[PDB]
Amino acid sequence: TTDGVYRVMTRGSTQVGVGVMQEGVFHTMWHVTKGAALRSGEGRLDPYWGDVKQDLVSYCGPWKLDAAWDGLSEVQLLAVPPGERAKNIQTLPGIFKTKDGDIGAVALDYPAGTSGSPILDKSGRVIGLYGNGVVIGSYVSAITQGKR
Amino acid sequence: VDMYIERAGDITWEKDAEVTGNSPRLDVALDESGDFSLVE
Numbered sequence: 312t313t314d315g316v317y318r319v320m321t322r323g324s325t326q327v328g329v330g331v332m333q334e335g336v337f338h339t340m341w342h343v344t345k346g347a348a349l350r351s352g353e354g355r356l357d358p359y360w361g362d363v364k365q366d367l368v369s370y371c372g373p374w375k376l377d378a379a380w381d382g383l384s385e386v387q388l389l390a391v392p393p394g395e396r397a398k399n400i401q402t403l404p405g406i407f408k409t410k411d412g413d414i415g416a417v418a419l420d421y422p423a424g425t426s427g428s429p430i431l432d433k434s435g436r437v438i439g440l441y442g443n444g445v446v447i448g449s450y451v452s453a454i455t456q457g458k459r
Numbered sequence: 460v461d462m463y464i465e466r467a468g469d470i471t472w473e474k475d476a477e478v479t480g481n482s483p484r485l486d487v488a489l490d491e492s493g494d495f496s497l498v499e
Contacts (some may be wrong), residue, residue: 327462331470341493346476366493386489387472401498402480407487409496418481435472445487445495453495 312351316391316429319343326393330428333435337370339427340442340455344368366443367457374457378436380404380415386454387431387439388417393424399431405443415454417441430454436442 312335319328328343337349346368349356356425361368369375380386388400401417404415415438417430426442439454475484 312461313466314470315472316468316470317468318467320463320465322461322463330464330468331467332466344462347462349494350461364489364491364493367484385478387471387476389468391467397474399476400480401478403478404481405482406484408484409487409489411489413481417484418477418483427477429470433472435470437470443493443495446484447483447497448484451483451485456498 312437316389316397317423319349320393320429326424328442329391329425331376331427331429331440333437334372334375334386336372336375338374338440338457339368339378340440341366341368342443343427365457366455367440369457374440374458374459376437377459378438380431380432380438380454382413382415384433386415386438388419388428389431390421390425390441392422404452404454415439416444416451417451417454418451420450
């Protein structure tokens with residue numbers, strides 16, 4: 312239940328993704344868990360809110376993360392790749408231009424088990440999650456943020 | 460199928476971070492299934 316970044320594991324064992332614990336709520340991408348319940352030690356975490364089009368899901372309570380990219384500053388991907396310690400990768404986002412407005416995007420290509428890793432602004436707030444994107448052969452991830 | 464979580468760190472900015480990656484500007488569409496696609 313402690314705040315932090317977590318690996319999402321399945322059973323040998325494999326890392327299928329990453330997520331963020333904040334304010335007692337676990338945040339990850341829908342495609343990582345497909346809404347399955349999660350074990351945390353001897354406890355169980357049940358899905359509370361989810362949305363396939365946003366590709367997001369929260370457990371134990373409503374989505375808590377609300378910071379947004381400022382459109383000018385560098386950000387950090389707090390990548391938690393399979394078999395590797397959590398590490399920070401700094402980058403200037405590009406932009407996804409859509410009919411409904413602009414979304415920050417990071418042109419970083421990490422293993423699929425890194426999906427759900429948080430992207431941070433300079434104050435350390437989570438501005439979105441990594442792992443839903445497009446190919447241009449390089450992958451580019453939206454900075455996907457939910458609604459609080 | 461047992462799906463479970465393991466803590467991997469604090470959420471903190473690191474001053475000594477590796478820096479990499481471009482900043483492309485891309486026109487995209489988002490469909491009902493959450494899939495982004497390029498548009499021209």
